[PDB]
């Protein structure tokens, strides 16, 4: 397809976006500067995102065309991409399409970058085995035929579609990068003939069998983020593992993870775990989470000198003390445990974060050094005294110390008592079980800032 | 304070990364997803003002993805903002500053 005489741009180009660009791009003053077919034949690149383009009508024209980029347009029709033979690469995602049937015959390509479209049959794709990139997330897809023949593969996706069955990727043994998160995927036993794969991510599935992952040794990256995991037996093979996400899943036994001492990133909040002792000899760990388990002796944690991320919140913590081993924490999250003194923190020169709500801490002096804190966080603890003898007139010490060491003023106090520090005193006529008193100061500390509040509970004999 | 239920990594993502694109950086997380559903969104440069879409965020889950390579002599840093709510449309958490650093 070509035109003959001198042609203005906008009637090649009928979108004005397009054609805006296209008079740049040939180097024209005016979108209506005349362009013959040699000018038009020059045009090997181009780089077009982002530029609301509704249509690609006079694409067609620029035969020379081998490399696109019209994502993050407003593209349904690609028809006049049919005939450009010479594309070997398109980025085409975030547009409305739905048809990719002018794709078919595109077979010199190796890169198609299709994810955020409504497209549905990828039977179109079927003809390009010279692909070694292709990303379809985001779309509706239910069938994967297609990709049976595109045995020249390397990184494919296709993250968040309806994609149950796995069959069709059996013999693109030469996979290396693959994505299937979120689709209705259980049976992952094709995997096994994947034996080229370095990264895998299959977040938010429906997979509990991970026994064919086993003899898939070069594997550097897994993630299994939101699963049904109990047993991973299976990964104690995967010995080149750096970077592992098994959070939101149902495991309790980490003996397989022991070996594998290559790992910087380990993910596994949202399980069932009481025991840390196979994580100890993981010393390159930077980022360990291991929130919402079942934790309380953290204490082989000691030993991983490396971390700046850790998370452990929503667990049955008493004593913190094994994280003040870790010199270079940046960022600590323990909300809702039970812990009480947190001045082994103090040896935390290099927090930023510090997420400590919800806890049993009535005291905050220790953290008073903290100076690079740009995000805190103190509220709703809570603590009972060991019980105290009933008087008519019982009284019991405000325990509630600011970062500055004076003490916090009670915000309320049960049953009509008063107080004028540092005691608070009640006047109860009769027996009564219990009286308590809340706080609740803002403080901040360095740069963070937080609300520091609680009730304590005094039950009475 | 700003903190609120927040709980998020830092994020730093080398340049010319390999596909397949969208590819996860961290899962943004607001611990008030313990009170009910929070719908995950994102602001700032490289999200929703130019340049678009360099960055996005899975509205359910939390996921920060990146949309394509980056250049670290083209820009070197963005700055988005993370935000949390409920289904109702009310913010469960103030919108938090995020650094991504591009690295070597
Ligand atoms: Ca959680
Ligand atoms: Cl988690």
Known sequence: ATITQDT??????????????????????????????????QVTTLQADRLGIKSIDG????????????????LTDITPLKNLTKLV???????????????????????????????????????????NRLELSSNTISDISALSGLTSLQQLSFSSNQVTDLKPLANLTTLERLD??????????????LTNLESLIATNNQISDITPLGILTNLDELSLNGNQLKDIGTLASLTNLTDLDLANNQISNLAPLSGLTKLTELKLGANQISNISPLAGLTAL?????????????????????????????????????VSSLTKLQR???????????????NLTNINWLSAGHNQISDLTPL????????????????????????????????????????????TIS??????????????????????????????????????????????? | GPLGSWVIPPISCPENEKGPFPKNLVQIKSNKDKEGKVFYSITGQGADTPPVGVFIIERETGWLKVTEPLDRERIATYTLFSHAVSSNGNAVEDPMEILITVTD
């Open chain 1, 368 to 411: 008073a050094n903290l100076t690079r804190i740009t995000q805190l966080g103190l509220n709703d603890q809570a603590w009972t005294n060991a019980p105290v003898n009933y008087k008519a007139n019982v009284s019991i010490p405000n325990t509630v110390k600011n970062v500055t060491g004076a003490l916090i003023a009670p915000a």
């Open chain 1, 415 to 461: 049953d009509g008592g008063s107080y004028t520090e540092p005691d608070i005193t009640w006047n109860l006529p009769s027996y009564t079980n219990e009286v308590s008193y809340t706080f609740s100061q803002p403080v901040t500390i360095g740069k963070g800032t937080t609300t520091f509040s609680g009730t304590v509970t005094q039950p009475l004999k």
């Open chain 1, 8 to 41: 203005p741009i906008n009637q090649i180009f009928t979108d004005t976006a397009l054609a805006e660009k296209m008079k740049t791009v040939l180097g024209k003053t005016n979108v209506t500067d005349t362009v013959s077919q040699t000018d038009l034949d």
């Open chain 1, 180 to 193: 299937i998160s979120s689709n209705k995927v259980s049976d992952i036993s094709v995997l096994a003939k």
């Open chain 1, 286 to 322: 930077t980022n360990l989470e291991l929130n919402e388990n079942q934790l309380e002796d953290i204490s082989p944690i000691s030993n991983l000198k490396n971390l700046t991320y850790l998370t452990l919140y929503f667990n049955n913590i008493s004593d913190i003390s094994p």
């Open chain 1, 59 to 74: 694409v067609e024209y620029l035969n020379n065309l081998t490399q696109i980029n019209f994502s993050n347009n407003q």
């Open chain 1, 332 to 346: 600590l999250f323990f909300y809702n445990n039970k812990v009480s003194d947190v001045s082994s923190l103090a």
């Open chain 1, 89 to 131: 690469d398109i980025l085409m995602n975030n547009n409305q399409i739905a048809d990719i049937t002018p794709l078919a015959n595109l077979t010199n390509l190796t890169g198609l970058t299709l994810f955020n479209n409504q497209i549905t049959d990828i039977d179109p794709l079927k003809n390009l085995t010279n692909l």
